[PDB]
Ligand binder design. Structure first.
Ligand SMILES: O=C(Nc1ccc2c(c1)CNC2)c1cc(Cl)nc2[nH]ccc12
Lengths: 39, 154
């Protein structure tokens, strides 16, 4: 049996750790909701 | 039932394992379908029964319809309020990329976190939830790029 516990509030926080790149990927989504890279 | 971000846990395996994350907003619990697989949830003495769900959109709402309607503007940076297993909730600011599909383009966050982080909200500057993290693709370097998955509000 799955359960839930609160982890925090949903607010925008200034001065947060800024990381990660912005890639443009050609993808396809199947009937099962799974993405796959089209090349 | 207080508004906010929540961990989705299970006792079926060894100890207390975190299977995913979700957002409580307006008395409705939102999460990625692959986290619960449509199963009912528990919140202390109360019980959350599913109301709406779709495997392709990979989304599911509990107690009422999907309430989240905000969207990425294609221009500004967003924040993934990441809630990782056994670790404290933390906002990670990033600029999204694009998943280009035959049905349209979608925002994409290139942050790598364990699969138990699935369901963490993606936020805009107004603190509004613009999507959920957890459904994407594995790139050439083994890392994960997740889509910004948002449902529909009726
Ligand atoms: O497996 C993951 N996501 C998932 C699983 C099952 C299904 C879907 C997505 C949609 N159709 C059913 C996942 C999520 C995250 Cl955040 N990091 C990861 N790294 C590797 C994998 C993976």
């Amino acid at each position: 049996d799955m359960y839930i516990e609160r982890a925090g509030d949903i607010t925008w926080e200034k001065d947060a750790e800024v990381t990660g790149n912005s890639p443009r990927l050609d993808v396809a989504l199947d009937e099962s909701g799974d993405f796959s890279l089209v090349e | 039932t207080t508004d906010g971000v929540y961990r989705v846990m299970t006792r079926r395996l060894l100890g207390s394992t975190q299977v995913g994350v979700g957002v409580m907003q307006e008395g409705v619990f939102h999460t990625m379908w692959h986290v619960t697989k449509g199963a009912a949830l528990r919140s202390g003495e109360g019980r959350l029964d599913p109301y709406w769900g779709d495997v392709k959109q990979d989304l599911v709402s509990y107690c009422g319809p999907w309430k989240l309607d905000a969207a990425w503007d294609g221009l500004s940076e967003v924040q993934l309020l990441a809630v990782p297993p056994g670790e404290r909730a933390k906002n990670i600011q990033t600029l999204p990329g694009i998943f280009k599909t035959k049905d349209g383009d979608i925002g994409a966050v290139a942050l790598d976190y364990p699969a138990g982080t699935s369901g963490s909200p993606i936020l805009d500057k107004c603190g509004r939830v613009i999507g959920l993290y957890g459904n994407g693709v594995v790139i050439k370097n083994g890392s994960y790029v997740s889509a910004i998955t948002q449902g529909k509000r009726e």
